[PDB]
Design a protein around this nucleic acid. Sequence first.
DNA 1: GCGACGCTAGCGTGCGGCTCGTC
DNA 2: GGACGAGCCGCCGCTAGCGTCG
Lengths: 759, 759
Amino acid sequence: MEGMLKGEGPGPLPPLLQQYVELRDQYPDYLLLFQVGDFYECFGEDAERLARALGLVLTHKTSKDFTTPMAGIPLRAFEAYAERLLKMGFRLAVADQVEPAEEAEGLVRREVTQLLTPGTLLQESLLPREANYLAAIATGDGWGLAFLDVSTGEFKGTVLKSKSALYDELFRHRPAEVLLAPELLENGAFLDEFRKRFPVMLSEAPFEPEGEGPLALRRARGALLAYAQRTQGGALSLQPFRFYDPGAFMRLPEATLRALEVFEPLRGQDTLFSVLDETRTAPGRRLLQSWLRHPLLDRGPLEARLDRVEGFVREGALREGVRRLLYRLADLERLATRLELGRASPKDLGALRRSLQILPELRALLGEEVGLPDLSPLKEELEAALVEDPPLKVSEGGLIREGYDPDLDALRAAHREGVAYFLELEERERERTGIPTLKVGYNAVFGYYLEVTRPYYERVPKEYRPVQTLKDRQRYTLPEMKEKEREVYRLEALIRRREEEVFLEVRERAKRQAEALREAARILAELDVYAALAEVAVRYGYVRPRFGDRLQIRAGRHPVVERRTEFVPNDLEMAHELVLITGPNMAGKSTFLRQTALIALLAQVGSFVPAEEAHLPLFDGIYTRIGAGKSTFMVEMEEVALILKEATENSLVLLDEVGRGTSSLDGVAIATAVAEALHERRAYTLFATHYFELTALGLPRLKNLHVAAREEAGGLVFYHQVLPGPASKSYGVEVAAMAGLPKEVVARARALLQAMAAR
Amino acid sequence: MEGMLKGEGPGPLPPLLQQYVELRDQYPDYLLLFQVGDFYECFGEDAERLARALGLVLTHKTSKDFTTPMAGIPLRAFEAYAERLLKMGFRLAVADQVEPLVRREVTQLLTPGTLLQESLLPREANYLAAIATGDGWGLAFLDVSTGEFKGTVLKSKSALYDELFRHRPAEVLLAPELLENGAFLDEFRKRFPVMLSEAPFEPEGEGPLALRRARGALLAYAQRTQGGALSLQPFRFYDPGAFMRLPEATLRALEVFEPLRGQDTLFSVLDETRTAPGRRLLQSWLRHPLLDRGPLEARLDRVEGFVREGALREGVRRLLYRLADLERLATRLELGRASPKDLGALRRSLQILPELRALLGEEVGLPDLSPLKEELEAALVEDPPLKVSEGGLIREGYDPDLDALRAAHREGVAYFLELEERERERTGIPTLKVGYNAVFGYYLEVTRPYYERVPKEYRPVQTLKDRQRYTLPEMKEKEREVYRLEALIRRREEEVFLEVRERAKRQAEALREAARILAELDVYAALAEVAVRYGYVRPRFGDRLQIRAGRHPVVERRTEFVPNDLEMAHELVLITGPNMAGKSTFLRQTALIALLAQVGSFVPAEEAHLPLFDGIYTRIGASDDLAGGKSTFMVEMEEVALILKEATENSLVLLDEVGRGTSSLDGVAIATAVAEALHERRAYTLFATHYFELTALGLPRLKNLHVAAREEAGGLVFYHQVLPGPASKSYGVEVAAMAGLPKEVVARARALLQAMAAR
DNA sequence: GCGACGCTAGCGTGCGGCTCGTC
DNA sequence: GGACGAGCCGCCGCTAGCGTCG
Ligand SMILES: Nc1ncnc2c1ncn2[C@@H]1O[C@H](COP(=O)(O)OP(=O)(O)O)[C@@H](O)[C@H]1O
Ligand SMILES: Nc1ncnc2c1ncn2[C@@H]1O[C@H](COP(=O)(O)OP(=O)(O)O)[C@@H](O)[C@H]1O
Ligand code: BEF
Ligand code: BEF
């Protein structure tokens, strides 16, 4: 069994290393950072792991019995070191010195304070502005999926019917850490797939149900709670749990978000989010992200969001003001969580103090209708307790302003006089002794002292007690000092105790405002997004979309591509029609299909869109077969299957070259069958193809569009007008030619084309 | 800004920072790492970068009239950060404090393609490339770590890239004409993501102007790095036409050196060498396969040698295990950079050399370096320490002078161990210590308790927390002596070390000759090991290609591979069949076999009679990876054009589905003209395609082959057997069926398929 | 016939703070 | 000749080695 450390030597394990091992083996998969004084240390293999991982120095902690390897980091840089460690894949186990030193039974009590897992981080220097989720998956009457953002308290979940939907929902939440139920972990088949499709860190957790509802959900939830309650090291700050339904929002499958680069890019470029997000606050960025993750289906609310956006678009003044003020707004939502969790530092409070000071100016600028809570009381007391620039930890310098604590002002009082004492003494001695240069100094090793140089050694009085000798200076002590020096130390010792209580007292004051803090967060967060979205409209020429059943876009732009190029706008009019798009490659097709999707996605999120006029329907889902079973033809078909099993007459469907990857024959066939399928389905379908045949089909709701090329001076020039009607001819041979194919070889190809043409 | 440091304050740069800025300014395009004690420091704006790129602790360097930000890395961790900093595109300038107003100067210059330090280099060659212009392109490569100096003159920018790619340079030097040509540079970067450095191009040597100029850039640049004359072997001018052509398309398609992601390259599978020189040799061969049968048959003979002599093969492979890189070691010695540790490595190698000569025999021609090995065994500790000062380097009894000094020194230490035993044996203080410190030298140390038992013959010099250190009259001389010696011991030991290092440096050639012979042996012996392990057979060369049961060398190491036969002879061999059956793999094994053979290795087959191809030109698919404007089609055609302009009747061409990516018509049209062009070309063409039309062109040298699939259990199972003659079916619809396409859609497709047969 | 306490010099990650040598 | 390198002690806590209760 386990209970032994690494290295060389016989005899027993020292009292300390003993305590080290005892905790170290309770968290087997965590790197234990042992708190020994002003350092976090690791011994044995764990010590070696550290040293190399962080390039630290490898030393040893020797004792009678044996000597073991040692590696440590100064607490000062804990988080600094933590971050690096985490990014490498380690879960940290922070073992701190609970009870103070001065009142310990020899060996200071040490227990693991908190656990640092990638998806349960609370340290604000370790978290992104974006939401950081922990996700749990379980089975038992369908698939159970739940999320928890330990830093904000967001706690939600749902149950999905397929393994497809689970992954979709999971992928739109971009979970930073996943808990897999027993069943799934065992099943080597599943796990492989999951681990392959979601390269996120996995972790063990008990899936004993919790609360009420579908068995699956109760297990996933219990898992989250169990795991997080362990890493926080105490009760969690949870928000009402949401058992939501993803059928109430627009469907954004994984293949759509990826292909559409909503959140992640394909060519290390920009993404829809990147381009759109100009929020100033973090909760704001979070909200906006939430909105994209699940676009609305309901006309009313969207037309609510669009009004407020339009508001700031008009009120340029106001818009720039609210944004000017939000620049200074801190993450109240998270700050409120840290407070409730009793983790709020003076730094946090200082920040809270600044944020709350902004409130009134926002109130004025927008009017008392904003509904912002009145925290003026809390705001003020903070300004009256904290220093203009709050320190990091309490025990150190001044945190509480002078004149706020009677008990503490008397302390700084006594200390000022006490220090002045030693100053007075210097001059008293410089006279009695006649030694002009005599200094009165201090230092940790010997305390307050009287200093005299060599030229005056024979001039020092009997009374002076030698304390320290130096190259050419000697330091003495008088009895008086000895006393007054301890009066200073006792004051200082009392000053910390109190300055820290006053802090804790004031903190708790802010902690009773957590809820108020939280609602201000929400209001300010929407405020942030609304102004942001408007900021984006103005800067980039977006316009308010109008919803209806007919989609009529006028001078369209792909919101991301136009960001890095003179983009040629284009039109579109669809209505449950089948719209084939033909024309030479490099012409514009796909930069057209994608454009359509994004426009739709922005509108149904409450944002203005990149066009001149846009009349859009409320799509129940955007499905794509763009870009991306051993073969390529099978993979693409697997997708068409999916798309075909969920698209409704209210889905926007985008097909790019479906039918490629096989024989010409099976090509057209499958394409035709599929095109006919989406046609009956009655969904809005854009199909970019190379089979001109599909354009001639005998379908009632079939429309045709095309892009073109003009063979001019230097070969072919591709314009991007998406003109009406089908493409006339193919430019393959022309392109090949342009690509350098030997002129005789091209000529031969032209002859063959014209021969086959003659039937 | 020269003389300017990003900081706050008026007054001049203090002495130190003044030095810093002086060097900093000499190597502008580099990040200057300044030594300060046990750290490498950066100041001003540079310090902010160092801090940024490595996420360090930004702080400040302060003097009365100026304070600037600083950041640094431990003198030790250097080579570890250098790597990160190098990979980040940083060029480093190292300044070391000339071994004791210090005197700091720029020791090295760390650059991607000029690295000399072993811990920063790969076993493989590391080149610095330069390209110039002047009747064709000038290409010259240099590997400062080896001395390898070669070059050639290319006629087309197309051939240029190729040769530049075969070598995978680490850093390139473009001539000014090229740097100014906005289009080229815009293209070069896009196609060759690698560090580009500036460097003079004043011609050097003889031959073409473009070569001499490139050759000059190299020399000029590299010397700046290795601060002084370079150690290089005779410039080797070569002709790419003297070897088999291996263009970048083929090198990637075939994954000779790098995988298309999803590990395992021909090289990794093939590479089984035990030394670096060997790995470099074998890589060299793979890079330029031979045309001439003479040499090839010579290599095959050597390989067979070890396939026969198992005891010899196994004995040599054992001995070479971990054997050091004599070639690089020789260079370091010649460059005057060899570390004590290096000499240590060298002797180990020399100790093993005698055993290898036993096994092989005089035939081989290894140099007898026993004298050098006896010397190194006589002077170096059984673990020289490059890092630990430079002392504890020469062993006792090697050099009398040094020996006498160390001995004298030691007595002193003894004395200061007697004063200890003697004193406490008079003062009763069995505690009293005799330690030393730089500040005062030697002393006496007494703890707090014994101040009452401390005699007056003493003279306190320094007091500490729990103890105080005293002095004595009869102790100074014995200090000013121990030191005068510790100094001399350094002065002398370094002399000897240098003397020793020099003796090794005089054997540079013997070391290079040894390295080289062993490299061959290592290679032949490894090509044998591989043949024996995976069943490779010696190939025979003749105008007909005949491979009996050949397997893809790389693919098989991962699965049960089905071997296949092939009989070609200047024929157009089409391969049809369902995807997922094996068409593309087949083309690739055929190509890899041809390569292994013309590299002098055995092949993965039973019988292999192969023609000596002049080049292997592939068009094995991928396309659209820059993934920009260019349609995949266009990219594929450019490649085809390349082949048509290169392929001769003695070329092995592999066309994989050429024609896809456009209209079905142009598709077949282009695909037929190409197939025809290659037919008349009379080159060995393997064309996997889906256009059955090609299957029936009826050309005199046309031939059919195909793979198939059966209908087992549920759907389709692909057997991997390449049968003679064409396929007659397409399993598109069948596959969509397995894909999960709605039965109706599938049925609709089939109805369509046949409905076309009425044609 | 030795378990139990007390006193207390000393080491040690990384790194402020203190000291000392020189123009 | 007050200021600038350049380098040692010790932090906070735990231990081992010594006396000693009796
Ligand atoms: N309307 C447009 N305005 C400006 N650039 C465009 C437009 N449409 C396409 N492009 C650009 O032309 C190139 C080819 O477009 P893509 O949609 O991929 O074409 P297709 O399927 O037609 O080949 C891309 O670089 C794309 O960004
Ligand atoms: N000779 C062979 N022996 C064993 N597996 C093979 C062989 N040839 C191909 N395969 C496997 O068959 C699958 C399809 O082969 P691939 O060459 O891609 O075929 P294609 O162009 O016919 O689709 C791959 O998984 C590949 O690794
Ligand atoms: F990118 Be497009 F569909 F060719
Ligand atoms: F790889 Be094969 F051409 F599908």
